[PDB]
Design a protein around this ligand. Structure first.
Ligand SMILES: Nc1ncnc2c1ncn2[C@@H]1O[C@H](COP(=O)(O)OP(=O)(O)O)[C@@H](O)[C@H]1O
Lengths: 437, 385
């Protein structure tokens, strides 16, 4: 959205042709009734899935999904169907002719950039036949012309939707009564949105059913009163919007930190796959682990304290599960990445400061050229403020640099209060420790 | 030559040298042909018209030359497009004919026609070379066949297809063409066999498997008049000489490669004759003039509801701008994320289809709703009066 939108609107401004302020692409495209119908059919309730569903709806050509998780396969499995794999001797001959002469829709789920050539000229004559086919492994290398034929859609899950999905599943497993209240009020308020729609239908009926002699219909007075009555239940629904947006929200606020952590953990364990192949796993296994963790230790009493116990236990459970597959030289690294991905949201640690911690002399005379490289490394907030006479005191820190285990017993007193605070003081100590020693 | 600037300097060289030699009418050439305006487009089928007197192909058009003009060029091109539509079932060929496309068809004609010629065509996918060559071959009466890679990828298909090709261009003596592309290569070896086909044309013991003499014996009746040894006699080996002459005279080879990837350059280095004998032609991506031309070709037939003077021209301009831009966005995505993205003019056409269709849909629907806004105005008016 961002790049493309600013791009198109700057084109329009330079062109000087007139355009309307505000995108709202989804709103004036599809009626929300079908949106809700899909949301019964398993479409994720969040924005990105909404545009994705639009994109499949337009169906300019047959599509092909980049599908790291499996949203599209399940969606099509439910959307209107409720299947035949590519690798099968019967598929190339039998399944083709059945679908092509009677329209069975012939789903495929094993594209790996390798096309049986007979797939193509079928692609480009029953007039009751469609075909949706999708990939599995992310980061495709599709040929230019495979982009020419079919539309491409990415269902790469964002963490943003991920925390809502985990939020729903935790509300399920921690106590079903929460879901009872949830789905009860949610069905009620959905039906009350439909009741506002019925108010609109009543207005339209009042306006064009008669199409003349509206005024001579003195029952129109009753009709006018009827309009008011419908608004009154909307007022109840309006009240419910508050009763929802606090109560369920706080029932969700007890858990939406958890979901945040869960999403963080998942997007950590994604990237180790790129660190080396064979550290690859689904979301589904992670889901089983998550639901289990809730079952394992979650409920004793004192629900807020048990939220803190989530944060204690889930992390260890998933952590150990991944360690069982890890190699020695990668043991320390996975835990390190987990720590950072935890702190990139709450503590808001700068990626610039992360790169400072990963990558990196006139002033000082005693220290070594091997050391002076590091002085210039640290030198280029208060890193560029305390290499002066403070650091160049040379009073007691000479012993310090000599002492083994510099961090622990002979602590730097260069910033004693900053090290004391500890909200970031760890990370500060570590930038120091790496740059110096 | 890759960049248009390189072209501009060779034309400068040409004008300078023409002035150098032509030191006796130099002002006339400056007025007429050394001018950058279009001059002497040479073509064979446009200049003469069959006229369909008693039969459609009334007379073979004069063939040698044509003159400069663009109108009748496009009109006969569209004529011919309709013909190709009804010749081929399910042709499904919405070819848009703009100035550069016309020139490219002309160049394919120039190479295909010539006796003992062939031309390597380079360009990114979507440039249309594979689409253009079909018409370019149909006009030249040449038959065309492509190779199909079976479930088992092997070698015999090549051999039998080339045998049929020679016997079309040999014994029967018809005119043919060959349309290998990147899809028609699965290993190197195919390139070796074709390489020697460009060079010699004798396949070792494909035609000499106790068959060369029966096929040659099916041809000497033509030899009795063709070489015309006083209509008396002939010889045996000389018949094979005339046969290789015929087949190489009427076996044109049209190769169409990608410019990008890894394998193209060292494939060229592997086989010298490939880039050596064949002519070479570049297809640059479409510039803004072509895109606005396509935009107006598709907006003229689609400007039923979108009536606004002085804004249409800016509309077509801005649509071209959109396309040039999605090119740049593609480049940036690959640059940062190392994830491959591509584009084709087919998607631009599909985008115009979507524009037209959803515009008539939303125009009509939302304007029936706005007709209902006017029904509200009617209600207000009748109530007031
Ligand atoms: N001039 C054109 N106008 C519209 N569409 C085109 C044009 N040229 C090519 N295409 C589209 O590109 C597709 C592939 O064309 P092709 O001849 O294979 O190009 P290339 O040889 O560059 O790959 C065609 O099916 C057609 O839809």
């Amino acid at each position: 959205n961002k790049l493309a939108q600013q791009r198109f609107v700057v084109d329009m401004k330079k062109r000087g042709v007139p355009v309307t302020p505000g995108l709202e692409l989804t709103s004036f495209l599809i009626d929300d009734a079908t949106i809700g119908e899909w949301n019964l059919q398993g479409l994720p309730k969040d924005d990105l899935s909404i545009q994705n569903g639009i994109m499949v709806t337009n169906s300019a050509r047959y599509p092909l999904f980049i599908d790291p998780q499996g949203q599209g396969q399940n969606w099509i499995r439910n959307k209107l169907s409720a299947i035949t794999t590519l690798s099968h001797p019967k598929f190339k001959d039998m399944f083709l002719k059945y679908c092509m002469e009677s329209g069975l829709t012939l789903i495929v789920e094993n594209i790996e950039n390798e096309v049986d050539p007979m797939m193509d000229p079928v692609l480009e004559l029953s007039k009751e036949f469609k075909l949706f086919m999708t990939c599995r492994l992310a980061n495709p290398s599709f040929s230019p012309e495979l982009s020419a034929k079919t539309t491409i859609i990415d269902f790469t899950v964002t963490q943003s939707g991920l925390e809502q999905q985990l939020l729903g599943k935790v509300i399920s497993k921690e106590q079903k009564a929460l879901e009872d209240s949830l789905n009860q009020l949610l069905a009620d308020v959905n039906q009350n949105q439909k009741d506002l729609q019925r108010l609109d239908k009543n207005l339209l009926e009042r306006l064009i059913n008669s199409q003349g002699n509206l005024l001579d219909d003195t029952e129109l007075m009753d009709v006018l009163n009827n309009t008011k009555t419908q608004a009154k239940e909307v007022a109840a629904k309006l009240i419910d919007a508050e009763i929802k947006t606090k109560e369920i929200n706080e029932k969700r606020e007890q858990y939406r930190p958890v979901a945040i952590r869960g999403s963080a953990i998942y997007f950590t364990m994604i990237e180790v796959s790129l660190v080396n192949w064979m550290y690859n796993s689904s979301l589904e296994q992670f889901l089983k682990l998550f639901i289990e963790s809730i079952d394992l230790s979650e409920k004793a009493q004192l629900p807020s304290n048990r939220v803190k116990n989530i944060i204690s236990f889930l992390t260890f459970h998933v952590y150990r599960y991944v360690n069982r597959g890890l190699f020695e030289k990668d043991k320390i690294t996975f835990i390190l990445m987990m720590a950072f991905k935890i702190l990139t949201t709450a503590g808001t640690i700068s990626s610039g400061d992360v790169s400072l911690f990963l990558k990196s002399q006139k002033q000082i005379s005693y220290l070594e050229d091997n050391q002076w490289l590091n002085i210039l490394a640290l030198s280029k907030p208060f890193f560029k403020e305390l290499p002066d006479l403070i650091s160049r005191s040379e009073n007691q820190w000479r012993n310090w640099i000599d002492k083994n285990d510099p961090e622990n017993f002979p602590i730097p007193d260069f910033a004693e209060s900053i090290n004391q605070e500890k909200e970031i003081g760890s990370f500060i100590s570590l930038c120091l420790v790496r740059s110096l020693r | 030559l890759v960049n248009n600037k390189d072209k501009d300097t060779v034309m400068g060289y040409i004008q300078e040298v023409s002035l150098e030699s032509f030191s006796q009418i130099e002002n006339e050439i400056l007025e007429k042909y050394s001018s950058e305006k279009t001059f002497l487009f040479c073509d064979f089928l446009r200049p003469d018209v069959i006229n369909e007197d008693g039969i459609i192909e009334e007379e073979a058009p004069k063939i040698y030359e044509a003159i400069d003009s663009l109108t009748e060029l496009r009109k006969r091109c569209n004529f011919l497009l309709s013909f190709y539509n009804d010749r081929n079932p399910s042709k499904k060929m919405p070819l848009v004919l703009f100035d550069d496309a016309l020139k490219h068809l002309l160049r394919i004609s120039r190479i295909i026609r010539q006796p003992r010629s062939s031309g390597l065509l380079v360009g990114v996918g979507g440039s249309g070379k594979q689409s253009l060559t079909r018409l370019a071959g149909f006009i030249g009466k040449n038959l065309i066949q492509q190779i199909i890679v079976t479930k088992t990828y092997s070698d015999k298909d090549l051999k039998e297809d080339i045998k049929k090709g020679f016997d079309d261009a040999g014994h029967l003596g018809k005119q043919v063409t060959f349309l290998m592309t990147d899809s028609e290569v699965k290993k190197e070896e195919f390139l070796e066999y074709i390489n020697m086909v460009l060079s010699t044309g004798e396949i070792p013991n494909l035609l000499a498997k106790d068959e060369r003499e029966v096929w040659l014996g099916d041809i000497s009746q033509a030899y009795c008049k063709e070489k015309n040894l006083g209509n008396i006699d002939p010889p045996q080996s000389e018949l094979w000489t005339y046969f290789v002459d015929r087949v190489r005279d009427n076996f044109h080879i049209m190769l169409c490669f990608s410019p990008v990837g890894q394998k193209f350059r060292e494939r060229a280095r592997k086989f010298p004759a490939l880039f050596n004998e064949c002519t070479i032609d570049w297809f640059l991506p479409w510039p803004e003039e072509a895109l606005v031309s396509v935009a107006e070709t598709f907006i003229k037939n689609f400007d039923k509801l979108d009536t606004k003077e002085e804004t249409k021209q800016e509309l077509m301009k801005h649509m071209g701008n959109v396309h040039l831009m999605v090119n740049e966005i593609c480049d940036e995505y690959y640059q940062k994320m190392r994830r491959q993205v591509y584009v084709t003019p087919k998607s631009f056409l599909s985008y115009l289809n979507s524009y037209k269709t959803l515009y008539i849909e939303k125009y009509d629907e939302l304007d029936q709703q706005e007709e209902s806004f006017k029904i509200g105005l009617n209600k207000i008016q009748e109530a007031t009066i």
